[PDB]
Amino acid sequence: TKQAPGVSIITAEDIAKRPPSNDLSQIIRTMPGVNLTGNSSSGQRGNNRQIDIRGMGPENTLILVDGKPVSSRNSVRYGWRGERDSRGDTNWVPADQVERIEVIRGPAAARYGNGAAGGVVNIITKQAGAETHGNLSVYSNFPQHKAEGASERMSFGLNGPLTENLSYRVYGNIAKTDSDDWDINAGHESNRTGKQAGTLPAGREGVRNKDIDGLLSWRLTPEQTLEFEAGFSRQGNIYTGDTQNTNSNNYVKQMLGHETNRMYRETYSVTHRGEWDFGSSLAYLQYEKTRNSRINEGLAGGTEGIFDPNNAGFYTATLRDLTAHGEVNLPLHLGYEQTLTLGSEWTEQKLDDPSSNTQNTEEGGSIPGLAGKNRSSSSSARIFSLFAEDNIELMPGTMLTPGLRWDHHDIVGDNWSPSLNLSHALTERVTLKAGIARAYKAPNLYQLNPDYLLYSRGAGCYGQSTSCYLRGNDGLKAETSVNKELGIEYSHDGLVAGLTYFRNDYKNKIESGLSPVDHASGGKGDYANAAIYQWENVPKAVVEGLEGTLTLPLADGLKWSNNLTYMLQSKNKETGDVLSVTPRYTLNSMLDWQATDDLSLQATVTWYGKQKPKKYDYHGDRVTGSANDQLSPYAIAGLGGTYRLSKNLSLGAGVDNLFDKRLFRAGNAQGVVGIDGAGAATYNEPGRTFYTSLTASF
Ligand SMILES: O=C(N[C@H]1COC(=O)[C@@H](NC(=O)c2cccc(O)c2O)COC(=O)[C@@H](NC(=O)c2cccc(O)c2O)COC1=O)c1cccc(O)c1O
Ligand SMILES: [Fe+3]
């Protein structure tokens, strides 16, 4: 099965029958437990949604490629409301070179450590064979409404042997998703008056991709393998008017249709793999270098996250991320039969950002200990980590898996993340699973940095109208979460029925603070002597929900599958507001008809439940009017198919959103001056869209 309790596999076959436009989030999000959301509740950058596991936010979803971390979004400014203007990190590997995807949710993910408090998504690539193989994949879609951006995608792969002990695989992808038209939300925008009249919330950003990966596998002995791989990728956007607050100016408009951010991502990795008598061994060194070049934005008030016209032009933020990992695996023959794993891990994150730390203090007054001009660009953190797993067979069919992970973060201090995972055959058809772990979150380098400084004259300040600063805070604690799950699954002859309950108790969630810690001195007029807030740890928050699956084989050629997410709770227990905005439930339904040996056909439905916006504004006050708007439940249906022409050639074709259900971003969630709020209506849902596809492979 592709769904056990806590875990989902997506195969290459699934990727082909629900072909993604471009980013994998599209298909990853259809698993149980998984949503596609922003990180907090502002609605800012709300068309830039990313994979969210059990409502824990997408910063707590750790993305791996072939077991190796992706850190690139940590190169984008982390803003006052916990969003980055980033597309996330699931669009680095092209869909057609993926062998499979693993999604691991809650207690089974905490053993991976930093940033897995929601879970892990591990994107696995196809590997070289016994003979030389390769493929050519093309995809092209066609929206009904021309406003919306079409997508085109071309990718190859090519792999095989060279000597008897030498293998290679390479692939390369070129793709484009056109942006939505700059005006796509016209007539649907929130009410905009005075200076802000005419402003627009934006449609989906476009992107251009170039990815090129090369790998050599060398197995210098029967027991010993050595891999070298390098990746070069580049995403450049197509800008369509998006700004943090939905305000506009002339620089914004000048840039409509142009590249305004480009991310270059380079990865190099050496991996040694060892298999002998006492068991298995594995170690790797990865260097990820991310360059994030974008137009300078402002860092104050309504000017936070809009192109700054006084400082026109590009800056480049640089992320050097360094990862090395070691492990061994020992079968142990003892009074209980078992498997032991011992490992270290070391990472370094260097961040150079010459832009984010440049807000100055001439208006709100200055801040003792913080220079107003030429603050450092630099941040870094190292975590060292040790861990051990034991995989214990109590009695055949029953497994107990304890592990301990310890992490030393060189600023925040020591973390202890223990875990315990149980599975139990109760019957030959029924299996009970339980897991309880404490997962780990390192503050990001923006939260942590006393030189990172934002400003507002009042509207964004919690509990007051005066000017205020927000400041990074090196005193911060790590976020930890006690992720519980209890689940039960019937499985027999492709009949599958399972239901899991999960609760994550969430401690020290980091977030812009509520009380001033101090006041600056000096500055101009009514803004002088502004209040100073920091990034704080929220003492307690909770998420809670249900994951279900049901799979029935209607007849031989024909399979009916369903995945269910239901979100019971999502609560900042300090403020009482919600953490993320999710749909109350999500049901995904596929019917799969294997009509002939050669022709497969697929119908799908997704039902999304209601969605509620935040209740409180940036002041902490209760919102009014269109800031309260909710999104009603809706469903999206789709048909597609794949017709095999030969061993060497298949064709695909279908329609996403059969019934043309469309939604439109009206703005951000709350009122500001001149720009009424849009509540939960913060994203654009695309309409009917035809697509075709073609895959040739030897
Ligand atoms: O969405 C927000 N703005 C909107 C809506 O607010 C406004 O348009 C006005 N605004 C206030 O009167 C205000 C009254 C009382 C208190 C204020 O802070 C006001 O701004 C004017 O400000 C501006 O025109 C611009 N703005 C600055 O230059 C600025 C420069 C330095 C410092 C600033 O604070 C600035 O606004 C752009 O502002 C906007 O478009 C918004 C969000 C989050 C936090 C904010 O502070 C926002 O203002
Ligand atoms: Fe302001």
Residue numbers in the entry: 24 to 721
The authors write:
In Gram-negative bacteria, Fe3+-siderophore complexes are recognised at the bacterial cell surface by highly selective outer-membrane TonB-dependent transporters (TBDTs). The structures of pyoverdine, pyochelin, citrate and ferrichrome iron complexes bound to their respective transporters FpvA, FptA, FecA and FhuA showed that the ferric-siderophore complexes were bound inside the barrel adjacent to the plug domain, a position thought to be poised for translocation. PfeA has the same two domains (22-stranded β-barrel and N-terminal plug) common to the TBDTs.
We constructed four mutants R480A, Q482A, G324V and R480A-Q482A (double mutant) to validate the observed recognition site. Each of the mutant proteins was purified as described for the parent protein, and crystal structures of each were obtained. Co-complexes with Fe3+-enterobactin were obtained by soaking for the R480A and Q482A mutants. Apart from the mutation itself and an additional water molecule in R480A, the mutant complexes were essentially identical except that the B-factors of the Fe3+-enterobactin molecules were higher reflecting a bigger mobility or a partial occupancy of the ligand. We further note that in order to form this binding site, the protein undergoes the same conformational changes for all three compounds and in Q482A and R480A mutants.
